[PDB]
Amino acid sequence: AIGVKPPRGILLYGPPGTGKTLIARAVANETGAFFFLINGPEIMSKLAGESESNLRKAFEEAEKNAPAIIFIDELDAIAPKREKTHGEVERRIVSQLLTLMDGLKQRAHVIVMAA
Amino acid sequence: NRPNRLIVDEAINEDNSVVSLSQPKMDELQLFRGDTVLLKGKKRREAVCIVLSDDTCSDEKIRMNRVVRNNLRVRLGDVISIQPCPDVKYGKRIHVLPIDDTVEGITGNLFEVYLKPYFLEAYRPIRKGDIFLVHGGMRAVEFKVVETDPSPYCIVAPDTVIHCEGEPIKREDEEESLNEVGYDDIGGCRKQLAQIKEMVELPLRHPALFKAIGVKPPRGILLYGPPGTGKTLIARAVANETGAFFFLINGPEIMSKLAGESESNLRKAFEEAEKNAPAIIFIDELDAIAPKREKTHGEVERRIVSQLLTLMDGLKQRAHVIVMAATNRPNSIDPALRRFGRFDREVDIGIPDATGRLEILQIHTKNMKLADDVDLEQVANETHGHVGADLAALCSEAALQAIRKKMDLIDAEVMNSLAVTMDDFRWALSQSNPSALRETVVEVPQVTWEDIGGLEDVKRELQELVQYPVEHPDKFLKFGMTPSKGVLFYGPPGCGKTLLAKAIANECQANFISIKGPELLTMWFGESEANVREIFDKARQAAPCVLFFDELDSIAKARGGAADRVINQILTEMDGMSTKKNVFIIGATNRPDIIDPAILRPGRLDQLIYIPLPDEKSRVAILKANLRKSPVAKDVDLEFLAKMTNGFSGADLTEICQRACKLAIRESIESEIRRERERDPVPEIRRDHFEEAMRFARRSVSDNDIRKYEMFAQTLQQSRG
Amino acid sequence: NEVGYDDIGGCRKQLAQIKEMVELPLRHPALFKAIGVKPPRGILLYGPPGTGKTLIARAVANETGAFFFLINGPEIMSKLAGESESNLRKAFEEAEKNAPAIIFIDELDAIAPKREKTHGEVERRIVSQLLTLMDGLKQRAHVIVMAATNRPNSIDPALRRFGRFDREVDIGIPDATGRLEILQIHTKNMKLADDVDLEQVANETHGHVGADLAALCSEAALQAIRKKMDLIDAEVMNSLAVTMDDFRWALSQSNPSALRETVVEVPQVTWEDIGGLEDVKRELQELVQYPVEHPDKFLKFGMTPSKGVLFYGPPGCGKTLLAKAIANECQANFISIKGPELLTMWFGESEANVREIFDKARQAAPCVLFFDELDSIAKARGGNIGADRVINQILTEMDGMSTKKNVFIIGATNRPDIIDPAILRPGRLDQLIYIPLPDEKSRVAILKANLRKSPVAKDVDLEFLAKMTNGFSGADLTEICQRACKLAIRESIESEIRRERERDPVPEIRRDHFEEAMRFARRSVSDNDIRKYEMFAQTLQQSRGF
Ligand SMILES: Nc1ncnc2c1ncn2[C@@H]1O[C@H](COP(=O)(O)OP(=O)(O)OP(O)(O)=S)[C@@H](O)[C@H]1O
Ligand SMILES: Nc1ncnc2c1ncn2[C@@H]1O[C@H](COP(=O)(O)OP(=O)(O)OP(O)(O)=S)[C@@H](O)[C@H]1O
Ligand SMILES: Nc1ncnc2c1ncn2[C@@H]1O[C@H](COP(=O)(O)OP(=O)(O)OP(O)(O)=S)[C@@H](O)[C@H]1O
Ligand SMILES: Nc1ncnc2c1ncn2[C@@H]1O[C@H](COP(=O)(O)OP(=O)(O)OP(O)(O)=S)[C@@H](O)[C@H]1O
Ligand SMILES: Nc1ncnc2c1ncn2[C@@H]1O[C@H](COP(=O)(O)OP(=O)(O)OP(O)(O)=S)[C@@H](O)[C@H]1O
């Protein structure tokens, strides 16, 4: 019906504390999709060299199941503007995220979501 | 020339690997009854078949069935080229593959059961990558030749042992290896695509043509502009058309690599680009790789862009390689890569216009079964500030809106009878938030020059100041004298000064860039006066063009008891423009009070034109062209209101038109309301609505202001000391 | 292949300076008895980008025959930590290992920017390594280094001391004759159609660097290829050509990259086109040209010079062209910055642009300055609070201009009341020249020098412009000439339209064209401002303190 890739990538912006985690949890536990979320500060907590570790593995685990949805939380901590990125590893992490996001196009119809 | 021109059409013969042609054109091409050809069509696809003679077939048309037409990825009506292939060798090993969604329900080998009776001494020449249909088991299953031992082309002999290794993959077998969309997938920038093709025509079909051009026109083209305009897709279409080994990399893809891994694949892409004598490469998202020194804060990215600056001119004159660039901002790239040695040429895609968006919608709604009810034209002209990827998103949202009025249990009939409506396009258009606005984009107006009351002396004066240097370049060298590039407008605040500027922009058929004074102070509010320089550079790149600086009273009212550095920047880069390039600048104000008389100097915008009140046929002329969701007023005395001078002072006679048609709106809605209450709405507008709008009317500009402008009829004598 | 001395044009003076600097690795190798200084190592080349900084160095290296070991900026900076010494020590080692030699570094801003602009420590390490190996290799085997950039003040100023990189030579933009020479040496490897002139294109191009003229030649040749039907043979190879319309097309779809640089050349305005200002011409001639071409007469008895003068009068008056006139008949290059252009760099607290302008004035001696339109600065300091801060930069920098070095300063204003009266009351800018409403024969002089698609108006009443006195308030009488142009264009399109609908263009402008042009003409300044301006005929009584 539509071959122009119905949209991969949804932002959940707005005020904090409005249950944006709860929306993704309800969607995950209702829609019947295998859910593989990862946390923002958890992967920021990793050291240099291990920062790509579990960042590649989350998208690999999304590729493991043919229906799959992930939901990254607190992307504001992950990806600020280039002026605020005075550290090299933050730019490397957001480059890895962008590379894994645009390298995977319409592969096993996965949906990514962010709050 | 090019005697292989053919048009695809419906076939008379149902043979899968045999097409039909015409006998005298076969003898023109020296063809035969059983020879083999190489049909090259769009998306650089190739098909090998055997041409049979057909008397009912046209001379300039070719007939091919659903096997050959889907082999070239073309629809009904495309253009192909035919080259006969007389050097065919015989096949030794043949490997074919099935499709996963067409093999369920039947089990067993397809070699002796399906491949054997289809190739039972059939003498069908096959091409690698082509799809052939085999009928069997009360079905029709498609199979694709993937590898042969004569790998380009062969003839299926009975002695040819055919492999039967079964690996069904997908229906999308050609979506990742090539993605072979060509110039049919790009519209709205035909001039820019033609310029890009003429730049890259030294890689393609002019290989050793450097004796005639020893300057080697530049290695490195920039494709800047707004985001989401198909800058990646332009490069993909060019690389598919040229056929050279393409080795594109992404900016974040190489920023994801570590230190030491950074030089890895950066040296390797440029080294692998050397191995082909035709070679074009491209690097994506240059702002990730090449920012300014102030933006970056790491030594690794600066070492990466230093290595890129080394490897740009480290290779020279070697296999005439061309690098290509893509970004979303022109000044964001480092100026070390804007030198004349490296990455010299800069072209901009921009956004398409209404004709361009119409072309994009027409080539985009092909792969979607509409209901054949929409017009595709109001949506085309409506979507100002909508970029092409946003147009694709609008198409997907309209498809989702058309799907969403159905059942979740899918249907027995929604897949083969899907449809979209015109109201679906309106609802997708209403609930759409594009990011392609806020840019001072280029457009050509459509403003039907008799729609004004006319001001025929002033319109002829604008004609003489603009278009006679434009349309007569011989009169720039034979007769006449020095020109006056620019004109200023002054008079009443509410008049058609913007209307005259866009009118002469349309009548000149030149580009119309109309920035705003509040928009200028908005860009200055971010502390950036180089934006005026970038506006003038966009003007020079948009040659020929017409420039408009409206609302100079907004600049004039910030005098003080902010600052007027923006008009000083404009005045500095007003006389710093060439008398060539056929650029032209229009200025306009509302009052002559604080007009900063340093800008009235000759050598700049000099002609001061005082616009008077227009004649009695101004609102007649907007009611002459009254399309405006409304019928034309009829059986009414129009000049009788001009006798009463219904706010007859400059503009805002369209205010009387708005008031009277809103009275007609009230009348029609009240008629509908008591028609609904009861259980011809008078769409035309009659005399009492115009008379009541005269009753509720006020003058727009006072007589004292008219007296002041009459006193300022000779205001070219400024700078009083 | 390799290139020599004949491929540089338009900067023969600077090229001769470079040849004189490399004359010591040449015909005078052991020139130490004549001078013991060893005149300085470290030739610094600066100016616009793409102007041939690699080409001049390579040509000088091939003429001298010395061993050339050049390195680039970002090529050296592309090495990692620990490999910055790699090839940077080794280039100087190879310069040590063979005596008659020259080395060169390109893009010095990539290697050595200012230390505040640096972020990483390896950039500081690299600039300290350069600062060690520059004067550390002193009087060893007589090697000369050369440095190229795109901007001089972006270089680290520690690299511009006496011992390091002192002889700053500017390549600059080429001249119009320099553009002609660049096109002449660029059409060697191209068989033209022998129909262009290469001169009207050259003077019609303005502010294009030699790389841009090379790109213009490429664009014209690509246009001539594009208009031809493509066929894969040599029948289009031997028939390569360029047309005059191809050069006009290449001049059209291009942009002057060297525009907005403050231009340094001599104009071509040729004194005879003045309207009849004789006393002002004689006084400006005596105050400008007389010290220049007669230095022996300017050293015996008479005039100890007092430079600096400003023009004033009506706002629409003819005061701009006289600076160009003394530039033509003084044999001095003309530098004319704009008063509106000063506030562009005043916005942002950039005081160094005026320093760069006066440094260019020092470098381009002899020269005549022209600060046009100080009334814009007066407007910025009068309409609001402030603007009037670069006018203090003007007064401070102009006292750095000594009485020698062959410089002059010309002011310009329209309303002399608010031009900050400390400008003119000391010996700085002491002289005042009134520029009145002009003499009667300006209309023929406009018609003489500006030929411009039409001859002199034949058998017309020339004296009627002195009789009816059209535009009789100051200058800008040339509005009547522009109106005659518009009426001539109207007659031409009338004849063209009539001969278009029917199936002698009349290129002569008659008396009735001027008579009709009379009606669309007014004065240029109100009479009360005229009475005030000849009330300010004696306006040197400024600093009106109570
Ligand atoms: N739309 C909602 N419907 C029902 N309960 C809600 C809703 N929004 C908020 N709540 C309640 O408020 C709580 C909000 O939980 P939080 O996790 O703190 O919200 P949050 O948005 O996930 O916080 P962050 O900062 O965005 S991770 C929920 O656990 C509910 O109890
Ligand atoms: N002119 C166009 N016609 C049709 N589809 C287009 C056009 N431009 C973009 N698209 C669609 O938009 C997507 C590609 O957009 P992009 O290549 O991302 O645009 P872009 O100009 O390259 O901006 P970037 O690269 O993301 S910064 C595909 O889905 C295309 O089908
Ligand atoms: N003589 C006229 N004939 C027809 N329509 C006119 C006429 N004068 C004004 N209008 C209409 O009124 C509008 C006024 O637009 P503008 O020219 O922008 O007004 P303005 O006098 O320039 O003042 P602003 O600040 O630009 S709104 C035009 O766009 C027309 O729609
Ligand atoms: N004086 C000149 N004579 C002949 N050709 C020239 C001249 N100046 C520039 N060119 C041409 O323009 C090109 C510029 O080459 P370069 O010398 O590398 O310029 P550049 O100044 O070193 O570049 P940057 O950006 O300033 S490092 C040359 O290769 C020639 O093709
Ligand atoms: N006596 C004259 N001789 C030659 N040209 C003159 C004469 N008087 C006026 N002109 C021309 O008239 C024009 C205006 O004179 P300018 O000195 O350039 O005016 P300006 O100093 O720029 O001040 P404004 O405010 O811009 S008119 C120039 O094109 C001059 O060449």
Numbering used by the authors:
A (entry chain E): 232 to 346
B (entry chain D): 21 to 430, 438 to 588, 596 to 713, 726 to 767
C (entry chain C): 199 to 430, 438 to 591, 597 to 713, 726 to 768
Sentences reproduced from the published study:
Human p97/VCP (valosin-containing protein) belongs to the type II AAA+ (ATPase Associated with various cellular Activities) protein family, which has two AAA+ ATPase domains. p97 comprises an N-terminal domain (NTD), two ATPase domains, D1 and D2, containing conserved Walker A and B motifs, and an unstructured C-terminal tail. Six p97 monomers form a functional complex, featuring a double-ring structure based on the association of D1 and D2. IBMPFD/ALS is a genetic disorder caused by a single amino acid mutation on the p97 ATPase, promoting ATPase activity and cofactor dysregulation.
To understand how the mutation alters the ATPase regulation, we assembled a full-length p97R155H with its p47 cofactor and first visualized their structures using single-particle cryo-EM. The N-domains of the p97R155H mutant all show up configurations in ADP- or ATPγS-bound states. The NTDs showed all up configurations when bound to ATPγS or in the absence of nucleotides. The presence of the nucleotides, such as ADP or ATPγS, destabilizes the dodecameric formation. When the nucleotide is present and binds to the enzyme mutant, the p97R155H dodecamer dissociates into two functional hexamers, allowing cofactor binding and performing ATP hydrolysis. Our structures also showed that the arginine fingers exhibit different conformations than those of the wild type when p97R155H binds to p47. Our functional and structural analyses showed that the p47 binding is likely to impact the p97R155H ATPase activities via changing the conformations of arginine fingers.
